[PDB]
Design an enzyme around this catalytic site. Structure first.
Site, PDB file in Angstrom:
ATOM      1  N   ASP B  90      56.987   8.567  37.009  1.00 13.39           N
ATOM      2  CA  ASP B  90      57.298   7.148  37.454  1.00 13.39           C
ATOM      3  C   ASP B  90      58.633   6.760  37.027  1.00 13.39           C
ATOM      4  OD1 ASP B  90      57.088   4.878  39.154  1.00 13.39           O
ATOM      5  OD2 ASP B  90      55.262   4.305  38.040  1.00 13.39           O
ATOM      6  N   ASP B 245      47.165   8.430  41.142  1.00 10.78           N
ATOM      7  CA  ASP B 245      47.442   8.593  39.461  1.00 10.78           C
ATOM      8  C   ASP B 245      46.633   7.417  39.215  1.00 10.78           C
ATOM      9  OD1 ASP B 245      49.737   7.009  40.094  1.00 10.78           O
ATOM     10  OD2 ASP B 245      49.236   6.785  37.952  1.00 10.78           O
ATOM     11  N   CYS B 283      27.757  18.061  37.006  1.00  8.69           N
ATOM     12  CA  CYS B 283      29.227  18.319  36.515  1.00  8.69           C
ATOM     13  C   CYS B 283      29.165  19.802  36.184  1.00  8.69           C
ATOM     14  CB  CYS B 283      29.701  17.491  35.588  1.00  8.69           C
ATOM     15  SG  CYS B 283      31.237  17.546  35.064  1.00  8.69           S
ATOM     16  N   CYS B 285      31.686  21.090  34.389  1.00  6.94           N
ATOM     17  CA  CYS B 285      32.853  20.710  33.131  1.00  6.94           C
ATOM     18  C   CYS B 285      32.280  21.437  31.914  1.00  6.94           C
ATOM     19  CB  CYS B 285      33.325  19.622  32.715  1.00  6.94           C
ATOM     20  SG  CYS B 285      32.438  18.507  31.574  1.00  6.94           S
ATOM     21  N   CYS B 288      29.678  19.424  29.807  1.00  5.31           N
ATOM     22  CA  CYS B 288      28.328  19.362  30.156  1.00  5.31           C
ATOM     23  C   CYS B 288      27.672  20.614  30.107  1.00  5.31           C
ATOM     24  CB  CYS B 288      28.435  18.882  31.886  1.00  5.31           C
ATOM     25  SG  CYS B 288      28.945  16.938  31.690  1.00  5.31           S
TER      26      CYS B 288
HETATM   27 ZN   LIG Z   1      31.290  17.014  32.652  1.00  6.18          ZN
END
Ligand SMILES: [Zn+2]
Ligand SMILES: CNc1nc2c(CCNC[C@H]3CC[C@H](C#Cc4cccnc4)CC3)c3nc(N)[nH]c(=O)c3cc2[nH]1
Ligand SMILES: CNc1nc2c(CCNC[C@H]3CC[C@H](C#Cc4cccnc4)CC3)c3nc(N)[nH]c(=O)c3cc2[nH]1
Ligand SMILES: [Zn+2]
EC number: 2.4.2.29
Lengths: 347, 347
Positions: B90, B245, B283, B285, B288
């Site tokens: 930015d 963003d 999820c 990820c 998790c």
């Molecule tokens: Zn997760």
């Protein structure tokens, strides 16, 4: 694996190198145990990647938060924090009964956490008079027997964990000997040297180790609690110590202190602000592979969490590399040379 | 790869999905850009593993510390922080000259940092009167031309980076149209919608996007600056936005707020203290996969850095999974169904 087996593979003077086998894994000795229900700013996989074989947890902090019973309800500490290898727990560092924590409760909490290496519950400030050190040591030995009996009365614990006793006696050779005798008569899987690194200074700590460690069973591991700086570790291994724990690498790291083979540096120092070199020239850790002194200087100056993460990963890796060089040099009969070369460069 | 190429592969109503190709890599659109010279509490490899294709850096903060010139001396932002893919910066959110920062200095700083996507230097508070919004928009368009010329006069920058212009005009349709016209006449590689998410509320933000985004060149990416919550993102994509963003997933994360497909949760709530489920049921990820709500609850309550790390990794991964479901649903012509199903469950 067995519940507990310690085997010594090589020696050089008082120094030893070998392995402790336990159900959850093998521990290479001399060993450094990073201190945690988290090793601050590191995922357990990161802790393992640095080379740690075992970590330490605390009975005091965990019993307070989140609670021992809660952790057991949740499946125990290993499952809670995501570390599947051995964990050593300190015992929880007043009446004959305990502290308002007794030996029995201490052992129970360590059970509830699912500790692999359980420490006996012990009581000695520095300096101490001979009278006070003796009184304290004697209590500690009574509490060591209570710890032994509490552990043995719990079948699951006695069959799957190990119990270490802790030598007291302050800086007095006669009380150290009585304490060692007492502990050997009770019998433990390993023996800690307690009551040091409490303000006496390296010279005095080494003097006490010089007579104290030979009092302990030679065929069992010797753990020096709360030590220490890299040079403390090298000298203590020269005196017969097999296991170490200390918050320095983690705590130091978050405060800007990085360990290097040429001594510690404080990365906040303006001299590092444009230094593109890694923290240490020889370090094989992921942090030294990827980031500069300059970047880490910026992060720590800025109070960024990633600064703490990177400093801590490096320092624990440094300590593991130190332990590996110690192990290899003992196995090769050149540890005294290593110790001398290390000190010449580190200092 | 080319300096810059945006290609649209599929559409559904006003929504688009496609790719921006740049020298440092490909960006899948609609894209979410995590905000950084660090994405707080994450290593760049972790940021990439969540699926981010590009991150945002700031001209304001970096120019202050550690300094733009220092970063260029050190090899630029990519090398400094260890992120080798595209970075959007930015512009640095008073006189005609600039702020005591001018358009020219802003572009220079972004050059020194080595930004891949450079934002024009712009000036509008909410609420604003029509007169003030117009004055501000007009200044911003003069500064947009100065930004364009400064960028183009620097060969290395113009040959290797891209420049985005920023539409202003507050909530007024006529000023938004003038602003869009002005920016298209100058010509940029992409077009941001500025001046939203500054206090107007979702309903009003959506109303303004409804008329404002069609004013922009259809064949260039559309970036909504500083947005936002998952439902803001879905609605904005329904209105033609390609890039986002926001600090929410990072900042929120450190404060205990986890995003889930059933809505946000605050992990500090005592209801999670013995909850063995992962943060979110679906999820994918690493957080998790490995840790429970209960553990993360404990870490955040205790103020542990690993709590911030895990919450942040999950939330940025959540956002990337959201963007992937958006991309796939547009490519399959079922994004309006997805948007409805998402909202029904999230709310
Ligand atoms: Zn997760
Ligand atoms: C910092 N130095 C130091 N720490 C000690 C601890 C805790 C070990 N780390 C956790 C101890 N724990 C115990 N239990 N006994 C000590 O004598 C004992 C002695 C210590 N000395
Ligand atoms: C939080 N909402 C919001 N953030 C904005 C930013 C910064 C984007 N994130 C960094 C902006 N930056 C700019 N330059 N202009 C905006 O209008 C502008 C508008 C914004 N609105
Ligand atoms: Zn290193």
């Amino acid at each position: 694996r067995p519940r507990f087996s310690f085997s010594i593979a090589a020696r050089e003077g008082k120094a030893r190198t070998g392995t402790i086998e336990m159900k959850r894994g093998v521990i290479r000795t001399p060993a450094f145990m990073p201190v945690g229900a988290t090793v601050k700013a590191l995922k357990p996989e990161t802790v393992r990647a640095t080379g740690a074989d075992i970590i330490l947890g605390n009975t005091y902090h965990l019993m307070l938060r989140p609670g021992a019973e809660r952790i057991a309800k949740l499946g125990g500490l290993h499952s809670f924090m995501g570390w599947d290898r051995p964990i050593l727990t300190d015992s929880g560092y007043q009446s004959e009964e305990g502290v308002t924590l007794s030996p029995e409760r201490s052992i129970e909490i360590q059970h509830l956490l699912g500790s692999d290496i359980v420490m006996a519950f012990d009581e000695t400030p520095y300096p101490a008079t001979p009278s006070r050190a003796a009184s304290s040591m004697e209590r500690s030995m009574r509490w060591a027997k209570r710890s032994r009996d509490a552990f043995d009365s719990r079948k699951e614990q006695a069959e799957n964990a190990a119990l270490f006793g802790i030598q007291q006696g302050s800086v007095f050779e006669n009380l150290r000997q009585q304490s060692a005798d007492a502990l050997a008569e009770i019998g433990f899987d390993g023996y800690a040297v307690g009551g040091l690194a409490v303000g006496e200074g390296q010279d005095e700590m080494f003097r006490v180790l010089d007579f104290s460690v030979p009092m302990l069973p030679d065929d069992k591991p010797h753990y020096l609690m709360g030590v220490g700086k890299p040079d403390d570790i090298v000298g203590a291994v020269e005196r017969g110590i097999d296991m170490f724990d200390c918050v320095l690498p983690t705590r130091s790291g978050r405060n800007g202190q990085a360990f290097t083979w040429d001594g510690p540096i404080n990365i906040r120092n303006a001299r590092f602000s444009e230094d593109l070199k890694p923290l240490d020239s020889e370090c094989h850790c992921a942090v030294c592979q990827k980031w500069s002194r300059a970047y880490i200087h910026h992060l720590i100056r800025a109070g960024e969490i990633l600064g703490a993460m990177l400093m801590t990963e490096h320092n624990i890796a440094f300590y593991q590399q130190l332990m590996q060089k110690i192990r290899d040099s003992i196995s090769e009969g050149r540890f005294s040379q290593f110790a001398q070369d290390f000190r010449a460069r580190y200092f």
